[PDB]
Homo-oligomer: A and B are copies of this chain.
Amino acid sequence: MSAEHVLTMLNEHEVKFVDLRFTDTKGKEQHVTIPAHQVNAEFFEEGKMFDGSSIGGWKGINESDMVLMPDASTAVIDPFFADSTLIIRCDILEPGTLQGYDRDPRSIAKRAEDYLRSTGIADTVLFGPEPEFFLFDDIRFGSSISGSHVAIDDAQDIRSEMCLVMEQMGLVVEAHHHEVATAGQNEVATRFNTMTKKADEIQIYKYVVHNVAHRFGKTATFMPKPMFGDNGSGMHCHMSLSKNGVNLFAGDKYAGLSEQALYYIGGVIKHAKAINALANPTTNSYKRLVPGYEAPVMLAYSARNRSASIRIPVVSSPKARRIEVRFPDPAANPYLCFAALLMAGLDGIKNKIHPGEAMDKNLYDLPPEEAKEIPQVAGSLEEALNELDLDREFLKAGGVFTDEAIDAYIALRREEDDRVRMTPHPVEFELYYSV
């Protein structure tokens, strides 16, 4: 899809505004709105000058402005704006060299895919994530200097009309798994795409979910553990690799899974805590990664066991042979999370890392001399951030991740880890006020 069709869309729909959208390192979606008459054919080869004071690494204290370069293939009319608006996802570029910014998640995902095609291991990667959310009727939260409080108060029309709006915005939905045990938790299934296209689709997914919940007087949250004792929100990711139109993950070994797939799983397992720094970036994210029942915390693979973090779905077709990693949560930044998973898999393929043996029939039942032995995902955000700081190397292959970008990301996550670490919590008043 080119720019000429975008101008044709502008004239066709009588678009008044164009909303240029990009993503922080935090994963939040930033936008600049320009009038539709400011969009010309030349606008797609210079972009728009932008002031980079966005939170995170973009708050670099030496530098000048950045460039918003739109991707014309991502244009879609916004369903929620009263004045007809055309949404375009943009990359952040350095104004001089006109190259992708080092601290841009979308540019990093594009670099990861380019490095994939460069190494010759595969031609493309297919990602299907399963982001789950919570729908609440109401919620009030706050934390002043004299205390804290939170209070959450828990239809088919909302779910169906979410699916309708998602299909308006170019997503191909194919199910909707409302859950009656742990009521409130929903998940819409969508079709697989490549890495950066699927990350853009996740951003659209969250936008639609939030706004449709708003219009029905509800509140949706992609927060990994919004509520005590009830099951948390996860985002399982199915990965496949394709070269010239055939799976590299289809083979003859365990559960019909190929040798390259086994090294992919080995690479994911080895770096899973550095990955956890990016796939599980919040402190809330580790209140659902606690050892127990149905918790994706054991770093091993099994088609049968459902305590293993890496699952191998059984499909009656060799053309659909993928691996599902289950520890990521929907609070991740899709670009950074997906790039981290891809680079871990590529480092596993490159170094012939063997995962080991399938943990078919060994759940959290605490085997006498195996519960401690099996690798686990990070236990807290500090541990994941420290392991990322130590294990930068697999992210730097091919120049996808800069040391400066990783440093800025880690500092930005730490300034929230510390705010959580130093406030006193009401459960500690319940337990330790008298003590």
Interfacial residues, chain A to chain B (CB-CB below 8 A): 1-2, 5, 8, 11, 16-17, 28, 30-35, 37-38, 48, 51, 53-55, 61-62, 64-65, 81-83, 85, 95, 156-157, 159-161, 163-164, 167, 170, 173-178, 180-181, 303-304, 314, 363
Contacts and interface: CB of A to CB of B under 8 A. Distances in A.
Contacts of A170: 8
Nearest to A37: B11
B156 A81 contact: yes
Contacts of A11: 37, 167
B64 A159 contact: no
A35 B163 contact: yes
Contacts of A363: 61
Contacts of A48: 175
A177 B81 contact: no
A176 B64 contact: no
Given A64-B304, A160-B81, A181 B55 contact: yes
A294 to B, nearest CB: 8
Contacts of A61: 363
B16 A160 contact: yes
A310 to B, nearest CB: 15
A34 B163 CA distance: 9
A360 B246 CA distance: 40
A173 B16 CA distance: 12
Contacts of A34: 174-176
Contacts of A85: 156, 160
Given A64-B304, A156-B33, A53 B16 contact: no
Contact of A164 (B16, B53, B62, B178): B16
B82 A157 contact: yes
Contacts of A81: 156-157, 160
Given A16-B160, A32-B176, A34-B174, 15 more contacts: A1-B1, A17-B160, A17-B163, A30-B180, A33-B160, A33-B176, A33-B178, A34-B176, A38-B174, A64-B303, A64-B314, A81-B160, A82-B161, A83-B161, A95-B314
Contacts of A2: 1
6 contacts: A30-B180, A32-B176, A34-B176, A48-B175, A55-B181, A82-B157
Contacts of A163: 17, 33, 35
Contact of A167 (B35, B178, B180): B35
Nearest to A156: B81
A83 B157 contact: yes
Contacts of A173: 35
A3 to B, nearest CB: 12
A221 B167 CA distance: 38
A299 to B, nearest CB: 21
Contacts of A28: 180
Nearest to A12: B168
Given A16-B164, A64-B314, A164-B83, A32 B157 contact: no
Nearest to A76: B8
Nearest to A311: B64
A286 B34 CA distance: 32
Contacts of A157: 81-83
Contact of A159 (B33, B160, B167, B178): B33
